[PDB]
Amino acid sequence: MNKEILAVVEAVSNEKALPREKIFEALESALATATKKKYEQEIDVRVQIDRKSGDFDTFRRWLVVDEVTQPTKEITLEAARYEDESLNLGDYVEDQIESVTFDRITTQTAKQVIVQKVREAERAMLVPR
């Protein structure tokens, strides 16, 4: 439970006037982006954050492939069946992978990614005025 993560969301929500959920979305995109960096295998990783607890877990996903050309971001159909027979060609598999503690990095690093997400919103907003 990282309280700093929940504290940074309150400063970005009032400063960006955006919903806290949206902020966590950008934070997850930054963690996953850096998360896959550790593997260096260009793997698709998704991280979910919990506002109540104040912590996020890193997760990895794969696409069902009949001839997976790269298992770093694609899962074979047979493998998908093992993880979930309900999976088929074109489906996505979910898996939990090691995660990095938020304390490992300072909130200033996330402040840079938060600005990029808000900078793109300046071009246009879903609800102008």
Curated annotation (Swiss-Prot):
Region (N-terminal domain (NTD) interacts with RNAP): 1-125
Family: Belongs to the NusA family.
Role summary: Part of the processive rRNA transcription and antitermination complex (rrnTAC). The complex forms an RNA-chaperone ring around the RNA exit tunnel of RNA polymerase (RNAP). It supports rapid transcription and antitermination of rRNA operons, cotranscriptional rRNA folding, and annealing of distal rRNA regions to allow correct ribosome biogenesis. Participates in both transcription termination and antitermination. Involved in a variety of cellular termination and antitermination processes, such as Rho-dependent transcriptional termination and intrinsic termination.
Source taxon at top rank: Bacteria
Regulation: induction: In response to low temperature. Negatively autoregulated. Induced by cold shock (42 to 15 degrees Celsius) (at protein level).
Disrupted gene: phenotype observed: Mutants are sensitive to DNA-damaging agents.
Comment block on domains: The N-terminal region interacts with RNAP. The central region is composed of 3 RNA binding domains, S1, KH 1 and KH 2. The C-terminal region contains 2 acidic repeats, AR1 and AR2, which bind to protein N from phage lambda during antitermination. AR2 interacts with SuhB and RNAP alpha subunit C-terminal domain (rpoA); AR2 cannot bind to both simultaneously. SuhB, NusG and the alpha-CTD of RNAP all interact with the AR2 domain and can displace the AR2 domain from the SSK domain (S1, KH1 and KH2) of NusA.
Native species: Escherichia coli (strain K12)
Lineage, top ranks: Bacteria, Pseudomonadati, Pseudomonadota, Gammaproteobacteria, Enterobacterales
Protein name as it appears in the record: Transcription termination/antitermination protein NusA
Range within the parent protein: 1 to 125 of 495
Subunit structure, interactors included: Monomer. Binds directly to the core enzyme of the DNA-dependent RNA polymerase (RNAP). Interacts with nascent RNA. Interacts with the termination Rho factor. Interacts with the phage lambda N protein. Interacts with SuhB via the AR2 domain, crystallizes as a 2:1 SuhB:NusA heterotrimer. The rRNA transcription and antitermination complex (rrnTAC) consists of RNAP, NusA, NusB, NusE (rpsJ), NusG, SubB, ribosomal protein S4, DNA and precursor rRNA; S4 is more flexible than other subunits. NusG and the alpha-CTD of RNAP interact with the AR2 domain.
Subcellular localization(s) per the UniProt record: Cytoplasm
